[PDB]
UniProtKB/Swiss-Prot annotation:
PTM field: Tyrosine phosphorylated by the members of the SRC family after exposure to a diverse array of extracellular stimuli such as cytokines, growth factors, antibodies, chemokines, integrin ligands and hypertonic and oxidative stress. Phosphorylated upon IgG receptor FCGR2B-binding.
Listed name of the protein: Phosphatidylinositol 3,4,5-trisphosphate 5-phosphatase 1
Compartment list: Cytoplasm; Cell membrane; Membrane raft; Cytoplasm, Cytoskeleton
Quaternary structure note: Interacts with tyrosine phosphorylated form of SHC1. Interacts with tyrosine phosphorylated form of DOK1. Interacts with tyrosine phosphorylated form of DOK3. Interacts with tyrosine phosphorylated form of SLAMF1/CD150. Interacts with PTPN11 in response to IL-3. Interacts with receptor EPOR. Interacts with receptors MS4A2/FCER1B and FCER1G. Interacts with receptors FCGR2B and FCGR3. Interacts with receptor FCGR2A, leading to regulate gene expression during the phagocytic process. Interacts with GRB2. Interacts with PLCG1. Interacts with tyrosine kinases SRC and TEC. Interacts with c-Met/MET.
Known function: Phosphatidylinositol (PtdIns) phosphatase that specifically hydrolyzes the 5-phosphate of phosphatidylinositol-3,4,5-trisphosphate (PtdIns(3,4,5)P3) to produce PtdIns(3,4)P2, thereby negatively regulating the PI3K (phosphoinositide 3-kinase) pathways. Able also to hydrolyzes the 5-phosphate of phosphatidylinositol-4,5-bisphosphate (PtdIns(4,5)P3) and inositol 1,3,4,5-tetrakisphosphate. Acts as a negative regulator of B-cell antigen receptor signaling.
First and last residues shown, out of full length: 398 to 857 of 1189
Length: 460
């Protein structure tokens, strides 16, 4: 049986509003309802991996697992294996996979982050799962961020705390947060960003929703506007939204948005909003295609509607040669020419680079670069032609061209990373000087750039 070069991944996010689900939730896993929906002809085709995020989940892990497995069994006639389940308070993530993938899946990690201090610590945060699928690293984050239309800044801070402190993936990648540790990272949940229009416009907003005219609403969506000003989710993607706001509904129908202020809401309006979202970040030049993004119409136990997203994701095999793993392939090398980092730092320390990749036996430290002044104030760290020659474990181009090099620029004085980025080895040519580029981030904020030239030698 050949190893796959593609898998499909189902991502679900549902704030259950502390109510048990209805007897049937199959529409969710079939991507049926409003938005970008899945073709009927695919209904019997199982996804390879289902990742279910819930918020305000009132069920035990046992109760929810039984509902999910029995749901997928009804749809597919396949009994899915439980990869991982992790719960923080009422925030939960479940990863289920087809039984044929059981021995393709390894290095399963779970973690949580609690957001806020005192008052604000006690029910918001994130849970996550990572694992290897053959040669491909996969991360999944389910976050329930701070609620309320006037707290978008608090949501942005929650995001930064989650991506700083969630401990998933390969701990040897010590300079890198979860936004660099995975071939494919999916981040979903009740992100709680609102449509920021005046309260007096509520009935107008409802009108627009009934006409399926979402354009003037999405232009005020706080997640889209914060993302466009680079305040949150920098270098993440989201599919176009073509489904009605998923919050806040009267329960047991979808015909009414319950937006007016009530004692139960802390006297806060809940204008119709896209609270419930799926975003992703994959390494450069890896295949990832969103094939559905929508909401269910028939699951009405919560004041939120479930959201689904499905993806095709490129995956690689667990490569063995005569040489690597367990030695180098002297027919392989990665050289860096005319390289320099540009940093927004106001500091003056020497800097060096670390190169991290699963194509190397271990990470590689460079010599210190040469600091120069940029013409517009910037620090420019010149490496020129001084960067070491990287020695991959496998020289076969069918392996090496599918790999990536993570780069950290570190202070010589503190050994703290000032910027992290990623370079694809999926080059237009081998044995050829080619431009490379990555933005550099730290705690998910832009800190600089790394650019130069690469020269990749493979066995071919
Ligand atoms: C040989 C590696 N090994 C394979 C099984 C894996 N566990 C697992 C994978 C997928 C579904 C359910 C599971 F329990 C733990 C590590
Ligand atoms: C170079 C890739 N990049 C270009 C388009 C950009 N678009 C965007 C950013 C923030 C909010 C809404 C958006 F549509 C996102 C990805």
């Amino acid at each position: 049986q050949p190893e796959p070069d593609m898998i499909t991944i189902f991502i679900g996010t549902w704030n259950m509003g502390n109510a048990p689900p209805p007897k049937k939730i199959t529409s969710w896993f079939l991507s049926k309802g409003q938005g970008k929906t899945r073709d009927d002809s695919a209904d019997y085709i199982p996804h390879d991996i289902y990742v279910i995020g819930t918020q305000e989940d009132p069920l035990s892990e046992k109760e929810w697992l039984e509902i999910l497995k029995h749901s997928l069994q009804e749809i597919t006639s396949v009994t899915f294996k439980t990869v991982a389940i992790h719960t923080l308070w009422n925030i939960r993530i479940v990863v289920l996979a087809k039984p044929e993938h059981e021995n393709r899946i390894s290095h399963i990690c779970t973690d949580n982050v609690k957001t806020g201090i005192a008052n604000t610590l006690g029910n918001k945060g994130a849970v996550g799962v990572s694992f290897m699928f053959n040669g491909t690293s996969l991360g999944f984050v389910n976050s329930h961020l701070t609620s309320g239309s006037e707290k978008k800044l608090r949501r942005n801070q929650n995001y930064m705390n989650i991506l700083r402190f969630l401990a998933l993936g390969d701990k040897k990648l010590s300079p890198f947060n979860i936004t660099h540790r995975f071939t494919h990272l999916f981040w979903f949940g009740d992100l709680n960003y609102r449509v920021d229009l005046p309260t007096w416009e509520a009935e107008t907003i409802i009108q627009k929703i009934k006409q399926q005219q979402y354009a003037d609403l999405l232009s005020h969506d706080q997640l889209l506007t914060e993302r466009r000003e680079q305040k949150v989710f920098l270098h993440f993607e989201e599919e176009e939204i073509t489904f009605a706001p998923t919050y806040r509904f009267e329960r047991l129908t979808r015909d009414k948005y319950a937006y007016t202020k009530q004692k139960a809401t802390g006297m806060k309006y809940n204008l119709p909003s896209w609270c419930d979202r799926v975003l992703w970040k994959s390494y450069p030049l890896v295949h990832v295609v969103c094939q559905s993004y929508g909401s269910t119409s028939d699951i009405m136990t919560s004041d939120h509607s479930p959201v689904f997203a499905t993806f095709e994701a490129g995956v690689t095999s667990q490569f063995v040669s005569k040489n690597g793993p367990g030695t180098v392939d002297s027919q392989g090398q990665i050289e860096f020419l005319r390289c320099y980092a540009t940093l927004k730092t106001k500091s003056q320390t020497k800097f060096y680079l670390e190169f991290h990749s699963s194509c190397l036996e271990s990470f590689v430290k460079s010599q210190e670069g040469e600091n120069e002044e940029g013409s517009e104030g910037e620090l420019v760290v010149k490496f020129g032609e001084t960067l070491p020659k990287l020695k991959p474990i496998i020289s076969d181009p069918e392996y090496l061209l599918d790999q990536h090099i993570l780069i950290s620029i570190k202070s010589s004085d503190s050994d703290e990373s000032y910027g992290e980025g990623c370079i694809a080895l999926r080059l237009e040519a081998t044995e050829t000087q080619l431009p490379i580029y990555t933005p550099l981030t730290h705690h998910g904020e832009l800190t600089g750039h790394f650019q130069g030239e690469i020269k990749l030698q493979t066995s071919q």
